[PDB]
Amino acid sequence: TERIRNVALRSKVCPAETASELIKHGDVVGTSGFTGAGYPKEVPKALAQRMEAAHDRGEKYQISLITGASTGPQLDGELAKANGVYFRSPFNTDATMRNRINAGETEYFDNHLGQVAGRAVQGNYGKFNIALVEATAITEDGGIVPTSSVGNSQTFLNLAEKVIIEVNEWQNPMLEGIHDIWDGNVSGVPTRDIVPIVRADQRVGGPVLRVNPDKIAAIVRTNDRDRNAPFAAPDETAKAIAGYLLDFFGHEVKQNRLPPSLLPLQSGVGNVANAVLEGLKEGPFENLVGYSEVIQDGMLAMLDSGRMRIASASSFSLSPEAAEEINNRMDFFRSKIILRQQDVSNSPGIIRRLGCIAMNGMIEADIYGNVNSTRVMGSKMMNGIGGSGDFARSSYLSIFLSPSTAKGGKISAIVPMAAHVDHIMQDAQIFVTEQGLADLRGLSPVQRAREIISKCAHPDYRPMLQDYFDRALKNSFGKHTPHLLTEALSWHQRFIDTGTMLPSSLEHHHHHH
Amino acid sequence: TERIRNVALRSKVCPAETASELIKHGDVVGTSGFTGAGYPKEVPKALAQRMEAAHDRGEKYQISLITGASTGPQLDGELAKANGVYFRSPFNTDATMRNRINAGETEYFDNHLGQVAGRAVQGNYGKFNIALVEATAITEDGGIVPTSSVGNSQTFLNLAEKVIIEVNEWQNPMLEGIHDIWDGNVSGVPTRDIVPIVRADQRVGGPVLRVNPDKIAAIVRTNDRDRNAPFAAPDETAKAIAGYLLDFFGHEVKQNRLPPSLLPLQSGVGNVANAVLEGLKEGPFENLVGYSEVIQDGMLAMLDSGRMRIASASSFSLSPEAAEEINNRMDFFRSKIILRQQDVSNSPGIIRRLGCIAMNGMIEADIYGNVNSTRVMGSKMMNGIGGSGDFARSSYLSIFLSPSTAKGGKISAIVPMAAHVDHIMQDAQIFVTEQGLADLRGLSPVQRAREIISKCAHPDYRPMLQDYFDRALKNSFGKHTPHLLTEALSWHQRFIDTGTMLPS
Ligand SMILES: [Cl-]
Ligand SMILES: [Cl-]
Numbered sequence A: 001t002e003r004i005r006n007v008a009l010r011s012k013v014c015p016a017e018t019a020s021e022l023i024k025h026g027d028v029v030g031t032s033g034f035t036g037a038g039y040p041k042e043v044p045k046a047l048a049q050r051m052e053a054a055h056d057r058g059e060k061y062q063i064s065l066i067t068g069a070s071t072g073p074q075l076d077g078e079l080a081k082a083n084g085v086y087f088r089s090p091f092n093t094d095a096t097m098r099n100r101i102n103a104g105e106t107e108y109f110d111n112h113l114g115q116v117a118g119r120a121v122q123g124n125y126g127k128f129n130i131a132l133v134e135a136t137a138i139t140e141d142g143g144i145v146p147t148s149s150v151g152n153s154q155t156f157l158n159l160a161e162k163v164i165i166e167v168n169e170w171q172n173p174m175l176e177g178i179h180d181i182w183d184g185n186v187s188g189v190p191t192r193d194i195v196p197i198v199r200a201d202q203r204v205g206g207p208v209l210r211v212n213p214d215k216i217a218a219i220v221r222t223n224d225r226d227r228n229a230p231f232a233a234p235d236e237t238a239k240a241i242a243g244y245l246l247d248f249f250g251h252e253v254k255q256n257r258l259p260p261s262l263l264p265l266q267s268g269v270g271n272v273a274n275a276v277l278e279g280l281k282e283g284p285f286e287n288l289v290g291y292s293e294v295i296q297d298g299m300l301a302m303l304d305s306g307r308m309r310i311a312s313a314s315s316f317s318l319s320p321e322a323a324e325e326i327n328n329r330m331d332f333f334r335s336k337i338i339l340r341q342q343d344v345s346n347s348p349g350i351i352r353r354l355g356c357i358a359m360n361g362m363i364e365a366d367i368y369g370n371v372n373s374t375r376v377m378g379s380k381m382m383n384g385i386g387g388s389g390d391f392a393r394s395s396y397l398s399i400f401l402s403p404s405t406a407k408g409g410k411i412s413a414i415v416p417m418a419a420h421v422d423h424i425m426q427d428a429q430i431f432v433t434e435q436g437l438a439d440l441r442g443l444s445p446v447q448r449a450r451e452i453i454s455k456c457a458h459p460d461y462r463p464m465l466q467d468y469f470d471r472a473l474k475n476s477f478g479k480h481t482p483h484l485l486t487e488a489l490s491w492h493q494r495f496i497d498t499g500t501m502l503p504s505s506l507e508h509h510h511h512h513h
Numbered sequence B: 001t002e003r004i005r006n007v008a009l010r011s012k013v014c015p016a017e018t019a020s021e022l023i024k025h026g027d028v029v030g031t032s033g034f035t036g037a038g039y040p041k042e043v044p045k046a047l048a049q050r051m052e053a054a055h056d057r058g059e060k061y062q063i064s065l066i067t068g069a070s071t072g073p074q075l076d077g078e079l080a081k082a083n084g085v086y087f088r089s090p091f092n093t094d095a096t097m098r099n100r101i102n103a104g105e106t107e108y109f110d111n112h113l114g115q116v117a118g119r120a121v122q123g124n125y126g127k128f129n130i131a132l133v134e135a136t137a138i139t140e141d142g143g144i145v146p147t148s149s150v151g152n153s154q155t156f157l158n159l160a161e162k163v164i165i166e167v168n169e170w171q172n173p174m175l176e177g178i179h180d181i182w183d184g185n186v187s188g189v190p191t192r193d194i195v196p197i198v199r200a201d202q203r204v205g206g207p208v209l210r211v212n213p214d215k216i217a218a219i220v221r222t223n224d225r226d227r228n229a230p231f232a233a234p235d236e237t238a239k240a241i242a243g244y245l246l247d248f249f250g251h252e253v254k255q256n257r258l259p260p261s262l263l264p265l266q267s268g269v270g271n272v273a274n275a276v277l278e279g280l281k282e283g284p285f286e287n288l289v290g291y292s293e294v295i296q297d298g299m300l301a302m303l304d305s306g307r308m309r310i311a312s313a314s315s316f317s318l319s320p321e322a323a324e325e326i327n328n329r330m331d332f333f334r335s336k337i338i339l340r341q342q343d344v345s346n347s348p349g350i351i352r353r354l355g356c357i358a359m360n361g362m363i364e365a366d367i368y369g370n371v372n373s374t375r376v377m378g379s380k381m382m383n384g385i386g387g388s389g390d391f392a393r394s395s396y397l398s399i400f401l402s403p404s405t406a407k408g409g410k411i412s413a414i415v416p417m418a419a420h421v422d423h424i425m426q427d428a429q430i431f432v433t434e435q436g437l438a439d440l441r442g443l444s445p446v447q448r449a450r451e452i453i454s455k456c457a458h459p460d461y462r463p464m465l466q467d468y469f470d471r472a473l474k475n476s477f478g479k480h481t482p483h484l485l486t487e488a489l490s491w492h493q494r495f496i497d498t499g500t501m502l503p504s
């Protein structure tokens, strides 16, 4: 059946190559795309080819690329291969784009996801020349039905001088109705509207993105798949982490500090999250609710069983198998899922009101429970802060989960001092590794260190951590948050120099004695 | 006139010593008090005396002390002298207590001020045994009229098993009516209520704290003074900082990025804030609105001149001179000021909705614009994060302001790497020192560094910072946020070793 139900707009249909010509060197381009879902695909591929051709002739051709969050090979990948992006925000997971960022070839700033729309409207990224948005369909009155994510698309459509729509027949038609797009002032000029969400299953808007049809310069018919990353199977480390967390939830319930239905749940993606979702499926809890950035594989089963009653997100983050499950049963799942603008899914006011439980990953934390989510050795970007700050700070409970080591034991995830900080002590209450769980509620920094070192640190590193702390307590400038500035970042430099944080027995180390 | 207007509650009046005996070793005690205003005074003194005697006899006697924010010598001071506090939260500025904290003798955690109530209700500090709250009066129906701050007092009254009220005759009776206490669920069990505030001047509650009178175990008649802010005027450094900020506001308005009346304003206390407020009083922006934590001298002056229409806060921080002024004209100022619960003044949902402009101080920032608000050399507590994070992250514009150096030039306020981080890059858009203003909007870390180093750093330190950055760009593990880990914290260590960040 016809996906473009507004007859007039059919006249704007053209090839991807032609559409890409609308995008000029220097342009600021806002696109759909969040957790590898719903980003434009064919126009960026064509743009990349033309960029490379220009470069080969000594002609400059680069854009500023602002997204919802991560995209995929067709967008971040192709443009990065072409060296076609001078600035990128707010969140990337493509390896080639990451390499451009870490080489300084692409300037990058990872804004809190829930804040991106507001900062865009304030003009922080400049004037938007293009909005490039993937659609499932265009309605009779010209509404744009998003695909597998909402992200920042409404904001980009509002701001952009010209609009290009990719109508993707790969995307299931029955996605129409799953989205909730509000015309309220969430990220516009103050005073903003109250975002009146008081339950995770509440709809406040309608099913379509709105745009003046006169701004639509091109529509491209496509048929291409999202990036449905392979299911990250939980390993025994992930299962141990989930076990400690689930035991903790169980205890909170028995102490009446959580209801038996817990509270609305947010989790980052990865095998730890997968392990947690598997544990919840088998746990004693009931009537669970998701209020998160993403819909993950493990939710589909819980929505199917009835263990989870509703899941709110801005995007899908599904494996190929889960994507197939939801496509064959979209009629059912559409009734169980709400996809929102990311400035709503990640709204601090709503997150706090609902009392979300935030569960996020990390690169490392220091002994005082400051968390690095982004910068390896302090300087090399991984993905970005994403919505981890939106959720950590606003949550009823902020939980960080990670293996206690990385790189086959050569890195400790618990260090004397984080090489970069994304989440301060005040934004992290519970830490979980395969070694155990640290409950830091109501503790001073020194008390936090005692819990993190004892419960979370790996046996290969705990004595080294204890030694640093003990000597810091004796010698630190102040004793409120003891540090030895001469060696605080020395484990990181040891890794840089030698490829491991484990000390050689060929030199003196205080913990060896 | 009689301050205890509920006739029956008069029967609960007793001496401070007797009231202090209600407080036991190990107790969690929640008190009034914020920015040196409205904390209990006489019961803590009596408690401290008894604690010292107990200790001398070999008896343990310590409490957990949870407040709104800072208190004064009668509370933090006396209890610290007595070594009587095992845990303290969320914000202290008393020197004796600070010394206890920095010696490891009192455990301390500086929670975001707007979150303290919610964390207390969740049980993070444990069961509240006592609420000790200063009052201006008790009304005929048993309402508790707060004094010079609201803070967390309503939450502590809700939570505590037993309540002690200090009714202080020193406090102006005309304070009654200035407070706005909401009966809704801001910091209680989820799902919380929507707070219907959509304008800074909107009152949504009543003038009194509510408490079950059966929980009132003692009422103590007191007569003692709050602390005052300094009178001292801002110097040329603070004035230069204010100048850059005011010029910035002007340009924003001209570019239609701010309304002619700006947006609701928040500022921390200090010389720089005073300079900004003084600048605003004689400035071109009319019909200003304050939505802040505190009412300070300059804030008062603008309400007077009409340049500011209304000021919302949780507390007062006034010089003796300004206190005299407001106390002589309370009827007027009462109509211009709203004192709210700190979980409302500091609510991120409200702050973002209103689009506040946040203006905060700092100990230091690094070249990438991460800000340390709290910990000198990374380990020695100054005051605490306070509400700076509540506001910085939620604000329409987050601005940080500071002299570019301290200790007669021996410390640089701009460093290669902050020794402790309270505000991440994402939470700081604008930096101002007496050297100039760095606008970091839309910039990558390397771009941020160029601006901070060139605009904000003192000339004595700028070449050193540029040298660090240039060498980091060449030799850093990654180039997205270049660092040299061997020397990132070396300026701090140099200060520790030699008393200055300047090389020999
Ligand atoms: Cl809201
Ligand atoms: Cl806490």
Ligand SMILES: [Cl-]
Pocket: A349, B193, B194, B195, B196, B349, B350
């Ligand atoms: Cl609200």
Ligand SMILES: [Cl-]
Pocket: A111, A119, A124, B440, B441, B442, B443
């Ligand atoms: Cl920005």
